Symmetry: D3
Subunit: 148 residues, 6 copies
């Protein structure tokens, strides 16, 4: 397992845009299973929405893109914080996303992504976000790693 | 129904609030058909503390969000017109997102212009599509379907 | 016995960034409560506690146990009543026998387990532990008092 | 140079969030004048309290943005775009005078700072000018800063 | 109308909220003449994250803002006493600032004391001037003109 | 070893940072014996947004935290003096907290004075006890046992 501290050593994202808390499964060039805890104590809930906290669907996707990003980094150079500290990640395409169940405080948002296709710095992954066994969202995306 | 709406009009229609209200002004609007709006991008926004340190790049997913909110405003006013009292008890869920492509990164100092056109709508379910533009160039394309629902 | 953030928001007066209970999984009147708060990196406290080493504050673990306990005491007397809830305030008088055994970090489901040690009138004494995946990460005893909002 | 983006502004000014009030610089003439701006969006924390339901960019923050522009002008005039010397310098602002507010600034506005050097003697720089939104003057003010060694 | 008001009272009179309410307590007040209030300066303020890293210094412009808010409080209570119901239908507008001097940097642990007197006043327009002090020493001087207006 | 330390010195000794650095200044410091410090309480602190709306009260658990940080500063410096290079490698952790009692609510405008005394110390293990005061009145009491550990 990779914990927050390791996640920090690979992903360029920081607060309040680092939406992955832990990595539970990793299989180079194949897939990755990870998650982020959802708590009321997040600033995003002050406006989405007042008196009715609902984790933004677009942030679920960002969390999936980030999980895929970690798969890309590690699959490319392994766990190398040195190289990681010079790159960043750009979103290229998002497609076929569907939300089925709203994610709320108290939820364990689990990301399940598999590599669809990749070449060089460009990676295309797809999968689902699950809560307690159920699919709350599915999506496909292509992200690109680049030098800062 | 007017065609130009300022931040105060937006706050009376959309349920979104800080830090998730991503539309500052509406420049033009055709009921049940089209809407053009924009959000200014400044370094003085909290998302930039983490995306990314020393390299402020407005998140691509937040661009989608702003396009969806533009559609949501279009949806609501096309349904009930500018009715703040009916609006204060509704929210908006994302149902789907398709064919989005990011062409140019958005940075502090940009005037991110949203252009959404209604592709199909029935009752509460609206499906809009369009682009996000900075200085007349297209920085993003997207298609999305969102649902308006009575808060309960 | 199962209360979600929405039910919690109606009883407790605490709001962001000081509402430290996300869900209530078990509740037995005048006896005990079991609730939890999710710990994620996406929380403002982690910007300074501490940079490059995220560790949920121990005093905030106690705060969450207090809120859980205050919630237990309140509903025990009046049940789920948003009305009365606005006319009352549960503040804590003492805290004691606190012990931190394990660090809580982003990714943990911080579970609160409080029971009613004793109560007399509006003064309630609760105690228990903070648990993460079965282990006891902390423990404490608290005495709260229920009063009229004012 | 003449045009600097947020990237360059970060290497010259010490100001950071939530006090970096200049997004880009569109004009720069050493020892003469500077034209820069900051976008005003609702998605800014200050709007949570100034004011609820009535978002109005604080007037003092406009004067601040103007002060930040003058400082970048002063610094660049002395050493040009030098991130390294930048880290060793300070620009204390000593006084502010003749500031008038004419039109409120709100979300959706492009706050353009127009400043010119009014006097430069030794380490003391005196600048003045206006803040403009869409060609109209929304505020004017005078400022005096001192260049010193950071510590 | 008394002369000591705490944050609870200031909240019911001034329209400013976090992170822009910069007056914590009013210690002295003379209708239409003068007021003495203060704001505690602590490191635990978001503004210090950027002003400046590893060198916390309270923004000079914010000290003026605090003096303005003190003036606004005096102005309002002078005209309507402690009236929260009417106070809710107003906001203050900065009209002018002049003669400001920043003599001493203000930092965490300082009790920023505001001293203002009415230089002129007629209707909603009030002109105040004075100093900001820390432990008896003048940290700043300023003159400002504000206006109380119907929020609509 | 001085007895007066300001925010810039506190920043070199404690690893705490916004929004968990709860000590603004140290007025008295006696090695292995005691420390007197304080934190200014202002409305301009994020914590008051939710504790509580329309009724700002400084969290009691945070008073404790501020007392512990003081005791922690006392601990480190009693052992190494003002050694920033070393402080950067150590970190103090709460082991226990006992006999905590809150007597008076803390609010904006208050100067929260920490008074901690060394009850016992052997190596990296320290037991401190004391009170939190506001204008000579005791608003809280507590005892803590801390541990000075490696930061790795
Ligand atoms: O008054 C207290 N907490 N909350 C009070 C309160 C909360 C809300 Br909401 C409210 O609307 C009102 Br009226 C309150 O008095 C409190 C907190 C800590 C204390 C510590 C020692 C003694 C008294 C205390 C009272
Ligand atoms: Cl959503
Ligand atoms: Cl992106
Ligand atoms: Cl801790
Ligand atoms: Cl203003
Ligand atoms: Cl300043
Ligand atoms: Cl408390």
């Amino acid at each position: 397992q990779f914990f927050i501290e390791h996640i920090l050593q690979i992903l360029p994202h920081r607060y309040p845009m680092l939406l992955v808390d832990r990595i539970t499964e990793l299989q180079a060039n194949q897939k990755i299973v990870a998650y982020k805890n959802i708590t009321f104590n997040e600033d995003v809930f002050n406006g989405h929405f007042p008196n009715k906290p609902i984790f933004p669907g677009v942030l679920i996707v960002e969390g999936m893109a980030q999980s895929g990003g970690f798969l890309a980094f590690t699959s490319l150079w392994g766990f190398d914080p040195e190289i990681a500290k010079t790159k960043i990640v750009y979103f290229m395409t998002i497609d076929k996303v569907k939300f089925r169940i709203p994610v709320t405080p108290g939820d364990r948002l689990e990301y399940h992504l598999e590599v669809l296709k990749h070449k060089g710095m460009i990676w295309q992954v797809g999968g689902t976000a699950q809560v307690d066994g159920k699919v709350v969202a599915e999506a496909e995306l292509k992200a690109m790693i680049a030098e800062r």
